[PDB]
RNA sequence: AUGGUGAACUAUGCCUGAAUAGGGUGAAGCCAGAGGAAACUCUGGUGGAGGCUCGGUUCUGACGUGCAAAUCGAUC
């Protein structure tokens, strides 16, 4: 990452996860996972008929 | 005798492919399994076959001359030729000497074809196939090892914009990255055969054209010429990439060797860095040397004589290498070692251990780190301080005089001749 | 072949009309009445 | 041999996880130095880009979204820096292209009196 | 400073034209003859070719106690 840390001096670097997550930011693939990108649209209003 | 009959029918078989499809996918029929004979005698002759019948413009990117079924015939039968001869070099050492004598002949089989293949894409295989064979750590009982070694060093002396030798040392660090750098030092001198790296620089008789013909001819030549200009562009890029990345993979190579420390590598190792040395980014040069003074210090806290003579010599030959652009623990370093040299019993041998070949052109390459025993690096360490990388200092030619005196009392005949000729060249340049 | 603009526009758009993930109040159209009735 | 195939997964994964652009320098700074966590950069990769298919899709479509599809989110010079450290490579600057340079600018300060 | 008008002032051109002469020596080649076992050389011719001819930065050098009272070696 090119900067120095605050605990050491030895060179900061980042975590497997954390650089997985940068490059599924800037080709936008699906940040938070244990979501469908394509639910079912649960009509929550439709579903009781009016008088 | 049916072995006559089937030589006869390869035979004719060649003088049909050579002077046609169908015959060689039936020529890869052959060679399948269960048949030693057909196995060995068609696979070294279809060899010569190749060696005429391969058109280097990389073939398989994907009228009355098809040229596509003929190509579709050669890829698709080169495929199944180099797989089985990738199922045929994998057989370990305990195996029929049958099936041996097969991986013998299939690599020689290979390395013949690389001098002439290597063009298309379909070279990465053969290449897996020959350096798979060289990094071994027992090779005693395999004659074609030296031959294929010769090979890679021609094949990376031709190589001048690069891509030969960077598709070659990107499988070769993947071998050298699972195996823990269990390598054969003439390894390392076919690592130094790269010549990608270093620079060291009528009227009468006219067959008749018509008036379209002529015109075809200028705008042929006007094409040619765009050509040899843009591909001069591009192997003056290309060039420039493959030094960049090459030099990543020789240098990591080199260091992670350096953190094993194999005992007959380090000459090899400290050969690639004096010669593959400034052409780095000249920010490494101070690094290289603060990395040869560590080296220095890690045989002061007790083979390590070859190791701390091997970083003086190599440190002066770096700095003498600078030839375009315009030292005290190095120095210092022979002054300290003077009584442990001349305290060991092995300043006189040989070296010719677990190297093989003696690379390329060793009567012109002068291996100026590790030319000989040890007391050629005592004279051209000696050599490196008062007639290159100036380093005058009258007062440690008197140190070093009567220090060398205090070592011919422990030096071998040949050793102290050589000393005494040094004193001469001493007297020649300090008269006191 | 060579086509025009506007046909290759359309073709193109016929094709994006189907490779698409398309939102389900959409595609509620297509899943239409059959020929009789 | 099968960690010959295995570790190159690896190392091709490695490739399609390095930094290469400016923009993704500043967010590994970012989450480096404390300034955002994991939690705040799942909150901002929700863009007015997120939930598109990419896999089904003809490339002559495809090609023309990527090229559109860039957020431009605000950059530092410290990123600059290390991403300019990042990319340069060995022969960058040899011994010869410096004794080249020196040549260059000789001749410049020779050109300065021949007028 | 803003807006305009012009530009061989100098480097590199490209297209299309014009001009690129003359006096002298005499290259390659060839012919005849003489030496040379042989190579080759010479004598005499011819032949008409020559950029043929005539109208100051640096070595981080060697000596910052000199090969030098006008330096060497070399790079471009």
């Known amino acids: 990452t090119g900067l120095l840390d605050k605990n050491s001096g030895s060179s900061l670097n980042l975590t497997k996860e954390e650089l997985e997550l940068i490059s599924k930011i800037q080709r936008n693939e699906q940040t938070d996972d244990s979501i469908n990108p394509y639910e079912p649209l649960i009509d929550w209003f439709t579903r009781h008929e009016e008088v | ?432 | 072949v060579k086509w025009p603009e506007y046909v290759r526009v359309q073709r193109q758009k016929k094709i994006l009309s189907i490779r698409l993930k398309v939102p389900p109040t959409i595609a509620q159209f297509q899943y239409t009445l059959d020929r009789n009735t | 041999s099968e960690e010959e195939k295995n570790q190159t997964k690896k190392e091709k994964h490695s490739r399609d996880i390095d930094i290469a652009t400016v923009e993704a320098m500043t967010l590994a700074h970012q989450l480096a130095l404390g300034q955002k966590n994991k939690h705040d950069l799942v909150d901002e990769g929700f863009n007015r880009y997120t939930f598109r298919d990419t896999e089904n899709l003809p490339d002559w479509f495809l090609e023309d979204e990527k090229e559109h599809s860039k957020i431009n989110k605000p950059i530092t010079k410290e990123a600059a820096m290390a991403i300019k450290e990042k990319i340069k490579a060995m022969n960058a600057r040899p011994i010869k292209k410096v004794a080249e340079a020196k040549a260059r600018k000789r001749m410049r300060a020779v050109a300065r009196l021949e007028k």
């Open chain 2, 1 to 432: 005798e049916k072995i006559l009959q089937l030589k006869e029918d390869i035979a004719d078989l060649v003088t049909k492919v050579m002077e046609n499809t169908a015959a060689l996918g039936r020529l890869c029929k052959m060679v399948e399994s269960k048949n030693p004979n057909t196995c060995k005698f068609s696979m070294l002759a279809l060899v010569p076959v190749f060696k005429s019948i391969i058109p280097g413009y990389r073939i398989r990117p994907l009228e009355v001359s098809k040229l596509r079924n003929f190509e579709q015939a050669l890829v698709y039968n080169y495929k199944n030729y180099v797989g089985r001869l990738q199922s045929l070099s994998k057989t370990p050492s305990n195996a029929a000497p049958i099936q041996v004598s097969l991986g013998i002949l299939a690599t020689q089989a290979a390395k013949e074809l690389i001098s002439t293949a290597s063009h298309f894409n379909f070279r990465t295989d053969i290449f897996t196939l020959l350096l798979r064979r060289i990094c071994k750590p027992r090779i005693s009982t395999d004659p074609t090892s030296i031959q294929i070694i010769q090979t890679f060093e021609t094949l990376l002396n031709e190589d001048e914009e690069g891509s030969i030798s960077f598709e070659i040392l990107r499988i070769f660090n993947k071998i050298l990255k699972t195996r823990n750098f269990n390598i054969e030092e003439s390894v390392l001198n076919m690592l130094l055969s790269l010549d990608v790296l270093h620079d060291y620089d009528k009227k009468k008789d006219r067959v008749h054209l018509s008036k379209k013909q002529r015109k075809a001819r200028k705008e042929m030549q006007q094409i040619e010429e765009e050509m040899r200009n843009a591909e001069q562009a591009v192997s003056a890029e290309e060039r420039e990439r493959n030094q960049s990345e090459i030099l990543k993979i020789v240098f990591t190579i080199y260091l992670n060797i350096l953190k094993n420390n194999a005992k007959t590598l380090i000459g090899s190792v400290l050969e690639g860095l004096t010669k593959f040395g400034n052409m780095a980014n000249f920010d490494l040069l101070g690094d290289f040397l603060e990395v040869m003074k560590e080296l220095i210090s890690d045989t002061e806290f007790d083979a390590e004589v070859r190791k701390a003579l091997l970083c003086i010599v190599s440190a002066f030959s770096l700095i003498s290498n600078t030839q375009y652009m315009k030292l005290s623990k190095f120095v210092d370093g022979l002054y300290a070692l003077l009584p442990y040299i001349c305290l060991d019993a092995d300043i006189e041998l040989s070296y010719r251990s677990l190297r093989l070949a003696d690379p390329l052109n060793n009567e012109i390459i002068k291996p100026s780190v590790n030319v000989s025993t040890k007391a050629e690096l005592l004279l051209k360490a000696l050599d490196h301080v008062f007639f290159r990388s100036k380093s005058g200092t009258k007062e440690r030619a008197t140190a070093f005089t009567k220090r060398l005196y205090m070592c011919i009392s422990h030096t071998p005949e040949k050793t102290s001749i050589a000393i005494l000729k040094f004193i001469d060249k001493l007297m020649n340049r300090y008269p006191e």
